[PDB]
Amino acid sequence: MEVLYSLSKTLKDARDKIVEGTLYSNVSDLIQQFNQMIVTMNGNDFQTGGIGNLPIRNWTFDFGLLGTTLLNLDANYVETARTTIEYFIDFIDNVCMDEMVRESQRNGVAPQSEALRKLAGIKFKRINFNNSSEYIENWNLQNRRQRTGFVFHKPNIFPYSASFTLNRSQPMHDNLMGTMWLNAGSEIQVAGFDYSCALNAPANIQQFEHIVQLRRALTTATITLLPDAERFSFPRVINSADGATTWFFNPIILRPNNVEVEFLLNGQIINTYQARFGTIVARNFDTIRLSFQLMRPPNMTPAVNALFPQAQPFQHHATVGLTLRIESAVCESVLADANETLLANVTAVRQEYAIPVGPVFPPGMNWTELITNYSPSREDNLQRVFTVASIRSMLIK
Amino acid sequence: NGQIINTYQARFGTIVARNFDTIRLSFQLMRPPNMTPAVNALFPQAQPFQHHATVGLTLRIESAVCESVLADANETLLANVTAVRQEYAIPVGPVFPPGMNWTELITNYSPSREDNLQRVFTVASIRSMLIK
Amino acid sequence: NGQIINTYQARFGTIVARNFDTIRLSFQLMRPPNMTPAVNALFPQAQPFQHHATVGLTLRIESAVCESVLADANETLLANVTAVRQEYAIPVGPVFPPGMNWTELITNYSPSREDNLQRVFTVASIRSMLIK
Amino acid sequence: QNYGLNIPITGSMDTVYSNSTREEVFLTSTLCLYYPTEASTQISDGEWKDSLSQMFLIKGWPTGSVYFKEYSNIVDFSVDPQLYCDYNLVLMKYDQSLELDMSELADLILNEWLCNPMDITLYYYQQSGESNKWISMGSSCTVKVCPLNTQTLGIGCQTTNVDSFETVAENEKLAIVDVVDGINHKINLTTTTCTIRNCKKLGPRENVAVIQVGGANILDITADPTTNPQIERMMRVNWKRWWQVFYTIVDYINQIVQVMSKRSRSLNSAAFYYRV
Amino acid sequence: NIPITGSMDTVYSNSTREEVFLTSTLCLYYPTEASTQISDGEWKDSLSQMFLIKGWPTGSVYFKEYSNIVDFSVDPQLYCDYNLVLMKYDQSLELDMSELADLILNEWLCNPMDITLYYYQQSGESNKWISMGSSCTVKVCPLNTQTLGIGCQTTNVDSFETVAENEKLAIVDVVDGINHKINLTTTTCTIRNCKKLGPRENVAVIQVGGANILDITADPTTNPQIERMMRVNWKRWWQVFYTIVDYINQIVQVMSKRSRSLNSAAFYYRV
Amino acid sequence: QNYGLNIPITGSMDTVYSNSTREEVFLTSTLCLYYPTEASTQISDGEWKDSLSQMFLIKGWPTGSVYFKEYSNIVDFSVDPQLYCDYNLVLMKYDQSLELDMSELADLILNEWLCNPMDITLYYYQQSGESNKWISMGSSCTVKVCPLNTQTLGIGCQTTNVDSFETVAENEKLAIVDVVDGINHKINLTTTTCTIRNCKKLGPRENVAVIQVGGANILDITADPTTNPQIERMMRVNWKRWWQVFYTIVDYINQIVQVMSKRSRSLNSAAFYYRV
Ligand SMILES: *[C@@H]1O[C@H](CO)[C@@H](O[C@@H]2O[C@H](CO)[C@@H](O[C@@H]3O[C@H](CO)[C@@H](O)[C@H](O)[C@@H]3O)[C@H](O)[C@H]2NC(C)=O)[C@H](O)[C@H]1NC(C)=O
Ligand SMILES: *[C@@H]1O[C@H](CO)[C@@H](O)[C@H](O)[C@H]1NC(C)=O
Ligand SMILES: *[C@@H]1O[C@H](CO)[C@@H](O)[C@H](O)[C@H]1NC(C)=O
Ligand SMILES: *[C@@H]1O[C@H](CO)[C@@H](O)[C@H](O)[C@H]1NC(C)=O
Ligand SMILES: *[C@@H]1O[C@H](CO)[C@@H](O)[C@H](O)[C@H]1NC(C)=O
Ligand SMILES: *[C@@H]1O[C@H](CO)[C@@H](O)[C@H](O)[C@H]1NC(C)=O
Ligand SMILES: [Ca+2]
Ligand SMILES: [Ca+2]
Ligand SMILES: [Ca+2]
Ligand SMILES: [Ca+2]
Ligand SMILES: [Ca+2]
Ligand SMILES: [Ca+2]
Ligand SMILES: [Ca+2]
Ligand SMILES: [Ca+2]
Ligand SMILES: [Ca+2]
Ligand SMILES: [Ca+2]
Ligand SMILES: [Ca+2]
Ligand SMILES: [Ca+2]
């Protein structure tokens, strides 16, 4: 795989630095690397594809070395370089597609795709150029562990889950109390609602608590915590827990008082913040406990007093919510983001050629299921296909 | 090109599109067959209709790959070009809209406009290499 | 990961699971349609119910293969580690539970605990090669 | 043990569920009309219960479900109102000077109550809170109270001379008296003809519904002055002919039971739980 | 109905009040006792001059006196473009006042009924039978599948179940889905089978007397207080009319232009 | 609080079970003894209620928490026997020929009957299943049932001739009448004097215990003839002296209350199922 990356990097460098009029001093080392690649790949046969609709293709290499007796590149040089580079780029693109489409329940790190399996031999170590990109560097470190980390912007670590729990309820759903929430992408929006405005709660304070269990620990995350979950601040009708009947929900937004937010790793509290909003940080956290409260206002204007009565009718229902965006984070394992098209590339490759559902990944690369159940074999396969997708993106966009 | 390339049915969260020129969001509003008395009083069979049922969909395009050049939330190319034009009060040209407002520039995004946009954006990249 | 890897219906005796993470045991209590007078007396229509119907299953994992290290009925590594801790009264540390209570150790099996467990088990086997 | 009160029920907001907890210990739901005797008087018929049962059979209720029950007048029905039955509708013929008695019967039946006795002649009683009332029912109740000081000396009334007591309800079949919460009280009424009970108010009995047959909207079940809620079950109609009223109820019966909900129903027929 | 797309940024248009006051007509239906108490007869001209201040041209206002509510109920023609109905409330007239309010406020599609030949059902919630006349006493005898009375004998009109007596206007709702035989005094009263469409935007009812009692929706459950059922207290009809004139802008703002492809021709007082 | 929902509840097995509750139930609840008048007649006293109260106080209960009720005899007691009282005992003196009446009362006050009214003059009534009976109460009940064909023509009787009907109760104060579950019936019963309710039997009423003071095992609470179960709360004590009977109950009051249990339908946890 390091060899595949080296192929892609040297072809990218050839397309970039071998340009008309450039000094040979600017591309001497690159030309030497290109000639090593040519001499190593020459006199070989590779076979690519043959799964789903990915058509079978045969690659044979017999090319002349780029010259070296030129002080300053001219137009004729670049024509020969182009004729070689386009074929090589097509070959690397097809190898990457073949590698991405495949899977393996066991030893998912080891390369599938007999083309790449051949490239992992002993004759092709001489192509190894350098491993600068974040994905390939972390690939090397993981293959021989030093501590690693991918920095992600707004990582979709939560599986999509919108739901609710009712700590107090009735069959006719007039006097409810509990929480609603939506975890999606990098958003946790949790709204605790009480239909009685904590009329009879101890000290007129109702307690809400939401536990989120990340599937992988995040590191040095930046978190924007604000009050007033928006999605649960307008009237709705909600199918019940059983689904038999629907119940109305008519929010009136109070603020959450003495909100505490705890970032835990392996059960111990790593970070804790109390009534701090805006941007905060979490050192290393695996679960989030958002605890907040609904205090009935001691003093009340005529209007709010008319809103919150002491009897059962309860036309309007008090709610307090939090919104929590993980703006950025650092994860040892790989994840989709909002800034990287790796997952999009892999899924598009599979969809284009209609690969049958394999043993490990879920159908359609459904990221919600994939993050919901994220076993280590699935993680290894995801890392392999993602790094190969990065290697492809270095040339094909 | 009017060819159904991807179709996601009752799947929320993150989704992907290989290549798409049009998005068709289809959804439905089903009257709740069973109804707590609160919602029943909320929706009457009579005429008044004092509360109006709605059903929504939000769709962010988190990231994409485009053959042509566009503005972003991550790139200061459009801002650089527009600022350079404004600082020196360039007269309105024959191709770009007055003030280079992105809304009217992408409402009509003809190929000549795209060509000039790519040129000025690439020059802005070259400048921003040095003068940030 | 939520996908049936194997499913066995009314096949008792020795069975094989290729690779699994969860076990779903479904069974049913079917009232005997035909009843001898004795059993019919056992199961009445009214409320008393002096006898209560029950149906059970027993599932033994005789042997298996695992990536993460575990304790067994065959390997003395867990016993060796816990014993050498108790011998010198090592104070309760961060990751392992107090006294190396295996139930508490496995009920939550965080990767930190797993890594430390593999290390200490490897050292335990290395010691067991010589000291018994 | 319980019915799983102390643990939460979870549900998804983006999924429509299928399987239901089918449970039924019944013949079927039973609609149940209470109508004043003047209705049958004006109707002047007597195959009319048969006629209405045939109508309800078209509307979807089997024969043996619907029941019709006559009461003389609302004030006399108030004394110990029994709802022996599943889906209760009560037709209250509004007329002037019965506003309080109607509103009070509505307050009694529409709401669930938890009542303890009151050995009136021995102790002195208070009212714990906003939800606590004294409900007195009988042939002729006449409640005369007397508040007491902290020293157990009457204020505005000598505790011995009953003539000085403050009368709060005079010769009524049903009187739901609220007095000041936190004052000991000595109570006097006609122990043979009336029974007084110390009743807390639980949630609302979401089973019985009240159709006001006559005019303006006056039903204020909530004894509080500030709040005057208009519940879904405080239905009303404009009437001239009882036949038209009954046809209206029959035609729109499905909507009425959609407003109601039969899940709240007690074993006994009493309008209030009794907890000695 | 074709779709009509519209932006959410277009600027609000100028006030159309003057345009509608120049282009439309207002008409007031009041009881005869109003004029009797006013004890005048230059008062129509005075009120027209008064309306001219608020901006209704001289011919735009039409005063159509009616004898009383029950007598006006019988087939009310609303010859106008914006209709106001002053409606004096008296005890025991609650249902008839409500009947008139329902009739005029709601749009009805009415079909003739031939009582002497056919037995009529009611299609559903929106269907009623409206009987109008000098004295309507509709008696109903429900029928079986074999056309035999239940609670009644189909040939003995005495055993029938009376649902209205001597009323100028009766809006009867019977149990839907059952055939009925009707006895109504065919020489006097006319009965029509009507379906309630949407509301009539053209008309507003100013209840003049007592409490909020009008119930347009025959459903017991819903009792919606529609915006066009205005109410005001009174002691002097002069004060009532001055109130209406002063607040005419609000009333016609509450009302709106009628929209229905009618089929029955009738006289209108348009400009 | 998720009233009206059957939510599964998990429970360990290594939990160390908690301490006693007898002190709680004694200091909170209310013991409640129903005895026949002949008991007091043989006692020939009238401080004896106070004496028993003091002895109960020695045995644990508070002073004002044990209550005594009298009844003329079992057959008269059977007419709407309501036990509004937190821990009910019924001393029941046995005699020949009252076996069925004792069984009727025992069934009625030991099992929770939920039930709807019956309009005898109008409807034909069909028994749904095993657990459905009709209970008739009054000063004199003489039920006459005529079964009906599928064409609604009586068999062994004529719909229009009450004489041919098949009587299944004569002047009984209480009658739990059963009929062939699945056939329509036309009933005649003396509507002015005796009322009849279509009732079906839920689980057992655990708040009531019946102490047969006399003879052998005869209470068949189960209408089915095949099963004759011996419930815990059907106690039996030999008697020759009412003082000795009351002393036995007082001494063993702990065990009797242990046999009994708090009324499920009175707990808050049963709020939206059938709470009473
Ligand atoms: C609904 O019921 C009324 C109540 O009876 C019906 O009125 C009846 O109308 C007929 C025809 O107009 C009357 O017939 C008259 O009979 C006498 C002798 O019996 C004869 O002298 C007349 O020339 C005429 O034929 C009948 O008297 C009258 N009933 C009463 C009590 O006055 C009404 O016709 C019924 N509705 C319909 C649509 O039929
Ligand atoms: C069936 O009902 C249960 C509630 O007891 C619920 O958890 C489950 O999701 C329902 N079935 C489906 C397919 O949703
Ligand atoms: C009520 O007052 C009268 C008049 O003094 C008295 O005779 C009667 O005993 C009182 N009621 C009670 C329950 O004491
Ligand atoms: C609308 O109102 C504005 C402000 O009064 C005025 O300038 C404008 O002329 C009006 N529009 C027309 C068409 O007169
Ligand atoms: C139960 O009783 C024992 C001794 O009688 C006592 O040690 C223990 O604390 C009690 N349990 C509780 C929960 O108090
Ligand atoms: C029962 O039959 C008698 C005649 O023997 C009759 O007087 C009585 O009214 C009947 N009761 C009922 C409820 O039909
Ligand atoms: Ca009263
Ligand atoms: Ca006084
Ligand atoms: Ca009070
Ligand atoms: Ca009030
Ligand atoms: Ca009749
Ligand atoms: Ca009328
Ligand atoms: Ca109708
Ligand atoms: Ca209405
Ligand atoms: Ca016979
Ligand atoms: Ca008996
Ligand atoms: Ca039976
Ligand atoms: Ca038996």
Query: How far apart are the C-alpha atoms of A105 and C3, rounded to whole Å?
Result: 13
- Does the beta carbon of D13 lie under 8 angstroms from any beta carbon of chain B? no
- The residues, ordered by sequence, that sit 6+ positions from F95 with a Cβ below 8 Å of its Cβ are F214
Q: Give the H or E element holding residue D104.
A: helix D99-110
Q: How far apart are CA C48 and CA F241, in angstroms?
A: 33
- E-assigned strands of chain D? 9-12, 31-36, 67-71, 87-92, 111-116, 132-147, 166-177, 185-188, 194-204, 209-212, 234-236, 273-274
Return d(Cα F87, Cα F260) in angstroms, integer.
8
How far is ligand 17, taken at its centre, from the CA of residue D181, in Å? 52
> Are the Cβ atoms of E198 and B47 closer than 8 angstroms?
yes
Q: Which among B51, B47, D258, D213 has a CA at the least distance from the CA of E126?
A: B47
**What are the structure tokens assigned to F21, written together?**
């509750």
Task: Determine the atom of ligand 1 nearest the C-alpha atom of E157.
Answer: 2
The answer, for A167 touching chain B at a CB cutoff of 8 Å, is: no
Name the residue among E20, E104, E34 with its Cα closest to residue E63. Answer: E34
CA distance E136 to chain D (A): 14
Residue partners of E47: CB distance under 8 A and separation at least 6: E61, E63, E241, E245
d(CA E181, CA A303): 55
For the Cβ of F19 lying below 6 angstroms from any atom of ligand 5, the answer is yes
Q: Ligand 3: residues within 6 Å at CB?
A: D 120-121, 162, 188, 191
Task: Decide: F166 and F146 in contact? Cβ < 8 Å.
Answer: yes
Show the tokens assigned to D168: 């709060």
Question: Which protein residue has the closest C-alpha to ligand 5 atom 2?
Answer: F19
In chain F, the residue whose alpha carbon lies closest to the alpha carbon of A171 is F4
Helix axes A75-101, A2-17, angle to 10 degrees: 150
PDB experimental method: cryo-EM
**Chain D residues touching A178 at Cβ < 8 A:** 8
Residue recorded with tokens 């035989």: E181
Instruction: Determine, for residues B12 and D260 on separate chains, whether the beta-carbon distance falls below 8 Å.
Output: no
What are the residues whose beta carbons fall under 8 Å from the beta carbon of C131, sequence distance 6 or more?
none
Which residue lies with its CA nearest to atom 12 of ligand 2? D17
Instruction: Kindly determine whether residue F203 and residue C47, on different chains, have CB atoms separated by under 8 Å.
Output: yes
Q: Does D259 touch chain E (CB under 8 A)?
A: yes
How far is the first Cα of chain F from the last one, in angstroms, to the nearest whole number?
Answer: 18
Site to substitute for ligand 5 among F16, F17, F18, F19, most atoms within 8 A of C-beta: F19
The dihedrals phi and psi of F270, each to the nearest 5 degrees, come to -95, 30
CB contact (8 A) between residue B12 and residue A344: no
Chains E, C in contact, 3 or more Cβ pairs below 8 Å: no
Neighbours of E178 (CB within 10 A): 21
User: Which chain D residue's Cα is nearest to F85?
Assistant: D276
Supply the residue whose CA is at minimum distance from atom 10 of ligand 6. Answer: F188
- Say whether residue A266 is in contact with chain C using an 8 A CB cutoff: yes
Interacting residues of F192 by C-beta distance below 8 A, sequence separation 6+: none
Q: E67 to chain B nearest CA, in Å? A: 31
Token pair for residue A276? 């701090």
**Shortest distance, CA A245 to any CA of chain B (angstroms):** 5
Distance D135 CA to ligand 3 centre (A): 19
Task: Please tell me the distance from the alpha carbon of residue D145 to that of residue D183, in angstroms, as a whole number.
Answer: 11
Q: Does D25 touch chain F (CB under 8 A)?
A: yes
Select from B40, B42, B43, B55 the residue whose CB has the most chain D CBs within 10 Å, as the one to mutate to test that interface.
Answer: B40
Task: List all residues whose CB is within 6 A of at least one atom of ligand 2.
Answer: A 242; D 17-19
Report whether D183 contacts D208 (CB < 8 A): no
Whether ligand 5 lies within 6 angstroms of the CB of F20 is answered as no
Segments in B50-131 forming alpha helices (H): 77-88, 102-107, 111-128
Instruction: Pick the ligand that lies closest to the CA of residue D132.
Output: 9
Chains with at least 3 CB pairs less than 8 angstroms from chain E:
B, D
Among all bound ligands, the one having the nearest atom to the CA of F21 is 5
- C-alpha span between C123 and C93 (Å, rounded): 18
Near ion ligand 14, which residues have CB within 5 Å?
E 215, 217, 223
CB pairs under 8 A between B and D: 15
Residues of C in contact with A362 (CB under 8 A): 1
Binding site members of C: 1, 21
- Tell me whether F2 touches chain A (CB under 8 Å): yes
Tokens of D115: 């009542």
Name the neighbours of F, counting chains with at least 3 Cβ pairs within 8 A: A, C, D
Helices (H) and strands (E) in chain D, counts: 6, 12
The residue of chain A with its CA nearest to that of B37 is A172
For residues C72 and A126, what is the distance between their CA atoms, to the nearest angstrom? 47
C14 touches chain F (CB under 8 A): no
Q: Which D residues 173-212 touch B at CB under 8 Å?
A: 206
Angle at D136 between CA D131 and CA D137, to 5 degrees: 130
Is E227 annotated as ligand-binding? no
d(CA A225, CA F77): 69
The DSSP annotation for E35-104 comes to HHHHT-SSHHHHHHHHHHHHT--TTSEEE--BS-HHHHHSS----SSEEEEEE---TT-HHHHHHHHHHH
Between CA D9 and CA C122 the distance in angstroms is 45
Check if F188 has its Cβ closer than 6 Å to any atom of ligand 6. Answer: yes
Expressed in Å, this structure's resolution amounts to: 3.4
Q: How many of the other CB atoms lie within 10 Å of CB of D25?
A: 14
DSSP bridge pairs for F133:
F199
Q: Is E246 annotated as a binding residue?
A: yes
Q: By the 8 A CB rule, do F104 and F175 touch?
A: yes
Using CA of residue E162, residue E164, residue E170, residue E174, what is the dihedral sign?
Answer: negative
Cα D29 to chain centroid, rounded: 20
Measured from the Cβ of residue D118, the count of other Cβ atoms closer than 10 Å reads 18
Is E99 marked within a binding site? yes
The tokens describing F272, both together, are 């939206």
| Bridge partners for A290 per DSSP | A210, A261
Cα torsion angle, B101, B102, B103, B106, sign: positive
Residue E140 forms beta bridges with which residues?
E161, E182
F227 lines ligand 5 (CB under 6 A): no
β-partners of residue E26 are E61, E82
Distances in Å between the Cα of B32 and the Cα atoms of A180, A244, D260 are 20, 10, 17
Feature table: binding site of B for Ca(2+)? 1, 21
Cα distance between residue F275 and residue B128, in whole Å: 76
**DSSP SS3 for A185:** strand
D252 CB near a chain E CB, below 8 Å? Answer: yes
Residues of A in contact with F5 (CB under 8 A): 169, 171, 242
Q: Give the number of other Cβ atoms within 10 Å of residue F43's Cβ.
A: 16
The number of the ligand 3 atom at minimal distance from the alpha carbon of D120 is: 13
B32: closest chain D residue by CA: D16
Instruction: Search chain C and give the residue with CA nearest A106.
Output: C19
- Of the candidates B12, B40, B45, the beta carbon closest to that of D259 is on B40
E158 CA distance to ligand 1 centroid (A)? 12
Residue of chain A nearest C113, judged by CA positions: A266
Distance separating alpha carbons of residues E84 and E51, to the nearest angstrom: 14
* CB < 8 Å to D59, chain E: 175, 177
